[PDB]
Amino acid sequence: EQLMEWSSRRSIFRMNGDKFRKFIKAPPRNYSMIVMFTALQPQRQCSVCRQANEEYQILANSWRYSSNKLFFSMVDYDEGTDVFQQLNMNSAPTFMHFPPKGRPKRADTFDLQRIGFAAEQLAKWIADRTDVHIRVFRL
């Protein structure tokens, strides 16, 4: 049932390895999870991560204002190193959707290199993957 613990609320769940596995890898689940894998710490100087996180934050708060079976989270490289390794990530940022049942599918990784990371675009993707339609407020 773990939903109740899933609230929890700074609009985007800051996850370590333990939290990622508990709330995303471990069953049971009946919710979808969106995860932004990022590297925001200043010594990394990932400008793309900083920009994309600002769009992610717009999307996540747009959900929070009107909306559970969908939650937003992030894994920062320097907080979830084991997680990047598990998922063979050599780069950042990436956005993924983890369905409640089984593994993410090929489309469950957002095509960032093709699309950009506009909030509106991320919401299009989430709707194609979960049928949850988020109307983005303010660009």
CA atoms of 139 and 130, how far apart (whole Å)? 22
**Whole-angstrom Cα distance, residue 68 to residue 118?**
24
C-alpha span between 36 and 55 (Å, rounded): 11
Q: Which two tokens stand for residue 55?
A: 């769009």
Report the C-alpha gap between 13 and 36 in whole angstroms.
10
Indicate which technique resolved this structure.
Answer: X-ray
- Do residues 77 and 44 make contact, with C-beta atoms less than 8 angstroms apart? yes
Q: Give phi and psi for 14, each to the nearest 5.
A: -80, 110
| Tokens 């969908």 -> residue | 70
Q: Which residues of 16-53 are buried (b: 16+ CB within 10 A; e: fewer)?
A: ebebbeebbeeeebebbbbbbbbbbeeeeebeebeebb
- The residues, any chain, with a CB within 8 Å of residue 55's CB and separated by 6 or more, are 117, 118, 119, 122
102-107-108-114 Cα dihedral, nearest 10 degrees: 170
* Burial of residue 11, with CB atoms counted within 10 A of its CB: 0-12 exposed, 13-18 middle, 19 or more buried: middle
- DSSP calls for 12-56: SEEE-HHHHIIIIISSP--SEEEEEEE---GGG--HHHHHHHHHH
Strand pairing category for 70-76 and 13-15: parallel
Q: Is 72 strand, coil or helix?
A: strand
